[PDB]
Amino acid sequence: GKLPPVYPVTVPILGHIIQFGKSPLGFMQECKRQLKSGIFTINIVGKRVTIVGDPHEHSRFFLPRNEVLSPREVYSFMVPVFGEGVAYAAPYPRMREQLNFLAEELTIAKFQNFVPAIQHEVRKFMAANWDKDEGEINLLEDCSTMIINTACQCLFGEDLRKRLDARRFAQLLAKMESSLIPAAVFLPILLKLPLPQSARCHEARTELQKILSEIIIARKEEEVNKDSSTSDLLSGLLSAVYRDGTPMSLHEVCGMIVAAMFAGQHTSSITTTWSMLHLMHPANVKHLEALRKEIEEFPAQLNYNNVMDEMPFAERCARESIRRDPPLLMLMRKVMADVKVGSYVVPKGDIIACSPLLSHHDEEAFPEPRRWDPERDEKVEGAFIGFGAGVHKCIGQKFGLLQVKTILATAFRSYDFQLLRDEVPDPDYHTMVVGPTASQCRVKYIRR
């Protein structure tokens, strides 16, 4: 069959890795502009990286089985985090099983107590750190602090939170996060050398696990003296059992807890800031009025129904904030067998990617790509892929957006915000999970 257009390689060894790095969006919009096609092949460090940059072919991307499009190979730099035997660090059936297990800690009945819990936290942080009529803050830093706090309140029990504060967790995670080298996807050999990083990525892991056991020991003491059949993310997973017959190990239960925190953490905190920044912006005044009238009606303490049902615009602010500036720029799969996309064939051994950033800016599907409109809809289907799609579709959106939409209803119901910048902050494209620049996120919270 035919092959997509190969993009001209100026620098032999590297490819367009440095170009890609400087202006991912720019570089990419350029690659699709100069070949009359949204299905091109850039060369990263010598590995063919075919980007499916046309929304009308997204399913082509997400629907294939792991057998045809498999992410274990491409996302293997992540293994140290999860530990061995968890997710992509384990056979697909096992990951699936573990996915099944996480999904069931986040069902609709689970959110019953999640709402007040989340709103409980956002009120402790708007009280201790926001006790003046006006003040200057770092919104990206703050949302982040609130998102890690809201997250843990929902997932972890009262006891585990004393033992493991929100501060001492953002640390343990971070220590693991920095020990990651995403470039290992194209420099695979990189995952075999003993980097000083991989060691630390594990020295931190062990410490969270030495706390889990010291917590699991106290819960079996409590139930016995005075019953504490306390249920949380940890209590639920610790009671899980594999179809194969065996229980789930402390090593794995701990591993999974990390897998979620990585996904959940920045991404949720960023989707908050972007949204808040967009909303507090004068140019979106009609989008502030729309928001405050949606929450205008609510009681002092929202419940599951208010947030899950009665906040369709807030979510539209979130979904669009992600659309305009998606925290995850590149979804990737390893091509197990030649597959078909557009009218071109994608060879085996080839690396297929589906960039949300690029697709989120297709003109046929998103006119005025840089205009933040919580009122807009995709003019091509499957066009919005902020939460991935198909086989590996995100199973935490409702929990992340649940967090995001709760802070908003809490924040804009008790404050006003301004930007110490004429314009919105620049998307700081240097980090693994992308949000706006941290320095350009100084804001002013005003009491009503």
Ligand code: HEM
């Ligand atoms: C707004 C914040 C979030 C965004 C933008 C986001 C985005 C994504 C994306 C794009 C994927 C697909 C990965 C790929 O295709 O390679 C994904 C997968 C996943 N997400 Fe999220 N996510 C968010 C929050 C969360 C949260 C809070 C959780 C759990 C607490 C979560 C759990 C997961 C899991 C378990 C997967 C893997 C599913 C699978 O491979 O079958 N996500 N997410």
Ligand SMILES: CC(C)CCC[C@@H](C)[C@H]1CC[C@@]2(C=C3CC3)C3=CC[C@@H]4C(C)(C)[C@@H](O)CC[C@]4(C)[C@@H]3CC[C@]12C
């Ligand atoms: C089986 C259960 C117990 C645990 C599974 C959870 C994992 C599969 C999730 C948790 C974190 C996770 C999702 C994320 C939104 C961040 C993630 C983040 C880093 C990374 C990134 C940022 C380079 C991006 O570019 C592509 C997506 C990946 C490759 C990777 C995809 C799926 C995850 C690894």
